[PDB]
């Protein structure tokens, strides 16, 4: 570590202009917790649709997506804001079912679903920014899930590269910038070795009110078709569509920073396989086609296996590397109790935890797995650089929340110093990155609404914009939006 | 609650123009945590300097106060920072021992310990601040302490009314604002309930390693004779140079805000009782010469008795109350063991934590009691307003913490964003307090430089003001201090 040339003599001195000119400033969403709409205009059914209506008691407030906060109809308004605030570009998501109501290419195509991003696609840019857009952000059409068990069935390949054709063509003469998948650890482990992402299932024996599953096998099994569905678009663009359209193709990881435990080789090596289990899962097969060795000699038979065709498929589809980063956690050699079941939260061999001998790592936010270390997104950013052969990286999410709270008048609710305290340190611990070789090109905050936090419900806030869901949907800019806004002047 | 008419459309519009032009703004410390030269000029030793020395394993990083920040040779570079920041005022403590020695009027005055407070004062005077000094800030002459246990005998009062003339008579003419003790709760809680501040007492069946002592008796006996030395000094003031020297004298008092675990009539009650032990105990005598009921229907005959004469002196001696206000903590009923052996914390029948089902109230700073819940200050504020007949009060210390943390460099150090984040929403709220009619004069931040914090040693930072202490005790200003100057600047 070697500092910044700067000298932070006033609050106004960390801004834009300590960035390259040409770095790119944006927010972040997804279809399922923006749009509403959910039955409108030959929309079919997603499996977070059915999830939280069939299990009300699995979401926290016992809330839906149905209206969420109605970007659908109120996106003018929306990017209205956008272009008030100085940003440059808009990560959204496509929703699967909205365009192809029931997944596969022969149920038909919604015309109405691909005239609604055709709007918000043109309304970006006529505001003058960039859309970045991903193509699966969780919601499997339900035609799926119901014909073969969506990311469980190896058929999902076939018919994610018919989908990935669709909006290449449809879109693909005014988007430039693909991001495939978001987040496949979150699907793996909260869609099938908790329980808590629909469809919800893990192992009976765990007592998480499952509806079905395998903890030690599943979560496998839906990391290896999400990474073989990921190559074949990818693969698709970069063969057919990139030479005509000019545009860039990646994929969106999210990683926590493992900080280890104490200084012992055992702690020191525990933190290693943190990531080797979060990162690496993806990360290894993207740049080398096989796993990390370290899953591998643990997970041995239960860890599929690539053809040798798919790994050929696989090493080095992506242009750019999307990097999510919330939080850190400390890491502990565990050890290995005899004759325990197996499942993949315990197969790394690892006790992670917020503290070490009481003292905490950081404070924590409204959610009960982030705390919050500023240095992690810097070491993170660094680990990526060294060990993965220095990547294009755009930092595609990164934010903190509050608890909904009912008491609050509006005035007390738009008093979110607490998140300007999050982007200023973590912005700095960005242009540190930058300042030590790390190739970051961009940086999107989650998010510019309050929102739907999947099975959390409407319990918690991420926006930098409050919405007030008894009035209208009423959008309510906190102090962190007016602070971000004057971080972006000149 | 009903907010105010402002419009926090921008990070600058809360400053000092939303206060009251009259309204005083400043910094807190005490002398054994500032001044240093322990044994210079003839001063004589405190219990805080015995204790640190003779049981080094009682602090947590081993360390003392012999230099601690050395303001005793500092004073007019550390006034110069004030000045450069546009405070009005400044509350420091004048040491015991280092104008009387041997603490009685009889072991002699210390001439030069008179000069480095003329001097001090002033500094203060010549700099555009006015001083608000407190005369007790836990640092009882060794003297005193081996001659009858110092707080613990009656023969304090005499000799604590001798001290205070002596500061009066030299002081008087330049300092028109008077604080006679600092924070009798703390003394009688950590002192004599749980060991951890000079002289180190607590009831053996405990094991916090203490050196003697009584939970359920010695604290009630602490407080009673600090009361005692209160009403002695206060009524010495008024009635004999009061009218020739046109200052004011008041006390300087320490709570927390209680809230209720749940709606339940038995949790509103306990947050009640944690109120009537915590702040009551030092009020109810101050305003109606006796204790609480709730302490006299609990507590019986381990709680001492006043005079006739000693509650006549006690009763409305302050011209002013000086608050502290840190932390928030939920309060819910505790049962009562059967057979449970006596002591001040389990006396009042409450369960006091940080949380509610798993559900934090806010989050923590670096010490362990200090949970960062900004309305607790305006409820405290109107709590006071409308229980105490609406006292003037000047708010004289609030605050946050961080670790002290070897590795980071110091432009990492130098970034207090969460520090930026308390002032912010506490400043706000005590705003809202004076809208609602509470009548808070002034407010006063601990503290501008980073300092010794007791028993936890130099491992906790709570300055705006980063202090190197490895090279020469340089000032480094945070980037709070930066912030303060300019909320301060018109």
Same mark, same amino acid.
């Given at each position: 570590?070697?500092?910044?040339?700067?000298?932070?003599?006033?609050?106004?001195?960390?801004?834009?202009?300590?960035?390259?000119?040409?770095?790119?400033?944006?927010?972040?969403?997804?279809?399922?917790?923006?749009?509403?709409?959910?039955?409108?205009?030959?929309?079919?059914?997603?499996?977070?649709?059915?999830?939280?209506?069939?299990?009300?008691?699995?979401?926290?407030?016992?809330?839906?997506?149905?209206?969420?906060?109605?970007?659908?109809?109120?996106?003018?308004?929306?990017?209205?804001?956008?272009?008030?605030?100085?940003?440059?570009?808009?990560?959204?998501?496509?929703?699967?079912?909205?365009?192809?109501?029931?997944?596969?290419?022969?149920?038909?195509?919604?015309?109405?679903?691909?005239?609604?991003?055709?709007?918000?696609?043109?309304?970006?840019?006529?505001?003058?920014?960039?859309?970045?857009?991903?193509?699966?952000?969780?919601?499997?059409?339900?035609?799926?899930?119901?014909?073969?068990?969506?990311?469980?069935?190896?058929?999902?390949?076939?018919?994610?590269?018919?989908?990935?054709?669709?909006?290449?063509?449809?879109?693909?003469?005014?988007?430039?910038?693909?991001?495939?998948?978001?987040?496949?650890?979150?699907?793996?482990?909260?869609?099938?070795?908790?329980?808590?992402?629909?469809?919800?299932?893990?192992?009976?024996?765990?007592?998480?009110?499952?509806?079905? !599953?395998?903890?030690?096998?599943?979560? +496998?099994? #839906? $990391?290896?078709?999400?990474?073989?569905?990921? /190559?074949?678009? %990818?693969?698709?663009?970069?063969?057919?569509?990139?030479?005509?359209?000019?545009?860039?193709?990646?994929?969106?990881?999210?990683?926590?920073?493992?900080?280890?435990?104490?200084?012992?080789?055992?702690?020191?090596?525990?933190?290693?396989?943190?990531?080797?289990?979060?990162?690496?899962?993806?990360?290894?097969?993207?740049?080398?086609?096989?796993?990390?060795?370290?899953?591998?000699?643990?997970?041995?038979?239960?860890?599929?296996?690539?053809?040798?065709?798919?790994?050929?498929?696989?090493?080095?589809?992506?242009?750019?590397? !999307?990097?999510?980063?919330?939080?850190? +956690?400390? #890491? $502990?050699?565990?050890?290995?109790?005899?004759? /325990?079941?197996? %499942?993949?939260?315990?197969?790394?061999?690892?006790?992670?935890?917020?503290?070490?001998?009481?003292?905490?790592?950081?404070?924590?936010?409204?959610?009960?797995?982030?705390?919050?270390?500023?240095?992690?997104?810097?070491?993170?950013?660094?680990?990526?650089?060294?060990?993965?052969?220095?990547?294009?990286?755009?930092?595609?999410?990164?934010?903190?929340?509050?608890?909904?709270?009912?008491?609050?008048?509006?005035?007390?609710?738009?008093?979110?110093?607490?998140?300007?305290?999050?982007?200023?340190?973590?912005?700095?611990?960005?242009?540190?990155?930058?300042?030590?070789?790390?190739?970051?090109?961009?940086?999107?905050?989650?998010?510019?609404?309050?929102?739907?936090?999947?099975?959390?419900?409407?319990?918690?806030?991420?926006?930098?914009?409050?919405?007030?869901?008894?009035?209208?949907?009423?959008?309510?800019?906190?102090?962190?939006?007016?602070?971000?806004?004057?971080?972006?002047?000149?």
């Amino acid at each position: 570590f070697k500092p910044l040339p700067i000298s932070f003599d006033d609050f106004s001195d960390l801004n834009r202009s300590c960035f390259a000119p040409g770095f790119v400033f944006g927010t972040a969403s997804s279809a399922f917790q923006y749009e509403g709409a959910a039955f409108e205009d030959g929309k079919g059914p997603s499996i977070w649709d059915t999830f939280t209506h069939k299990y009300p008691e699995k979401i926290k407030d016992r809330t839906n997506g149905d209206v969420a906060i109605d970007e659908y109809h109120r996106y003018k308004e929306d990017i209205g804001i956008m272009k008030d605030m100085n940003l440059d570009a808009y990560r959204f998501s496509i929703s699967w079912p909205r365009v192809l109501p029931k997944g596969k290419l022969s149920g038909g195509v919604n015309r109405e679903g691909i005239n609604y991003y055709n709007n918000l696609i043109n309304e970006v840019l006529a505001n003058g920014m960039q859309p970045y857009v991903t193509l699966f952000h969780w919601d499997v059409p339900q035609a799926l899930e119901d014909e073969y068990r969506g990311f469980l069935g190896r058929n999902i390949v076939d018919d994610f590269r018919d989908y990935a054709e669709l909006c290449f063509k449809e879109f693909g003469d005014r988007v430039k910038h693909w991001i495939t998948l978001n987040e496949p650890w979150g699907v793996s482990m909260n869609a099938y070795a908790y329980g808590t992402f629909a469809p919800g299932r893990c192992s009976d024996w765990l007592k998480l009110n499952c509806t079905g !599953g395998d903890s030690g096998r599943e979560p +496998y099994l #839906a $990391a290896h078709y999400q990474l073989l569905a990921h /190559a074949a678009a %990818a693969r698709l663009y970069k063969t057919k569509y990139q030479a005509s359209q000019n545009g860039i193709i990646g994929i969106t990881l999210v990683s926590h920073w493992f900080e280890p435990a104490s200084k012992e080789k055992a702690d020191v090596d525990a933190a290693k396989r943190g990531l080797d289990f979060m990162l690496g899962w993806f990360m290894h097969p993207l740049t080398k086609g096989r796993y990390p060795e370290s899953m591998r000699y643990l997970v041995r038979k239960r860890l599929p296996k690539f053809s040798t065709e798919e790994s050929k498929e696989l090493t080095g589809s992506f242009d750019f590397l !999307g990097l999510n980063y919330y939080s850190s +956690y400390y #890491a $502990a050699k565990a050890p290995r109790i005899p004759n /325990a079941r197996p %499942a993949i939260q315990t197969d790394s061999l690892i006790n992670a935890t917020f503290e070490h001998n009481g003292k905490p790592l950081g404070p924590m936010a409204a959610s009960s797995w982030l705390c919050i270390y500023p240095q992690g997104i810097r070491k993170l950013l660094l680990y990526v650089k060294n060990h993965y052969n220095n990547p294009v990286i755009y930092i595609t999410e990164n934010g903190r929340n509050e608890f909904n709270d009912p008491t609050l008048s509006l005035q007390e609710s738009l008093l979110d110093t607490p998140r300007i305290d999050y982007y200023y340190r973590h912005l700095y611990y960005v242009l540190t990155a930058i300042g030590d070789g790390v190739n970051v090109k961009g940086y999107f905050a989650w998010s510019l609404f309050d929102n739907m936090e999947w099975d959390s419900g409407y319990t918690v806030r991420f926006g930098l914009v409050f919405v007030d869901f008894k009035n209208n949907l009423k959008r309510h800019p906190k102090l962190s939006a007016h602070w971000f806004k004057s971080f972006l002047k000149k």
